Design a protein around this ligand. Structure first.
Ligand SMILES: [Cl-]
Ligand SMILES: [Cl-]
Ligand SMILES: [Cl-]
Ligand SMILES: [Cl-]
Ligand SMILES: [Cl-]
Ligand SMILES: [Cl-]
Ligand SMILES: [Zn+2]
Ligand SMILES: [Zn+2]
Ligand SMILES: [Zn+2]
Ligand SMILES: [Zn+2]
Lengths: 56, 56
């Protein structure tokens, strides 16, 4: 399924999508990108919309 | 000004924004993120909308 990451960082905002066979696969993928983009915040997940948010 | 990066990659799609004092500052910032997200493609820039696109 297609998962989305919403980044609400102080220096980086936006949205990334990726295809993953399960939610853990997508979340590990996304935690790597949030690290890469310097966004260290609070994580939430919405299963209905397959959307992770990271908020600084 | 706020610049945007549109990523149209095979494995990563989405949009990132950042504030930068000039376009070269934003583009260097964004080229680092596209590298980080594994998106190596053709770059275009639209000055009217301060938008870089990278397309695989
Ligand atoms: Cl799917
Ligand atoms: Cl950004
Ligand atoms: Cl950055
Ligand atoms: Cl500004
Ligand atoms: Cl992605
Ligand atoms: Cl990735
Ligand atoms: Zn799928
Ligand atoms: Zn950034
Ligand atoms: Zn500005
Ligand atoms: Zn990705």
């Amino acid at each position: 399924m297609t998962y989305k990451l919403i980044l609400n960082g102080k220096t980086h905002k936006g949205e990334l999508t990726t295809e993953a066979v399960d939610a853990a696969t997508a979340e590990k993928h996304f935690k790597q990108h949030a690290n890469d983009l310097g966004v260290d915040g609070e994580w939430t997940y919405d299963d209905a919309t397959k959307t992770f948010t990271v908020t600084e």
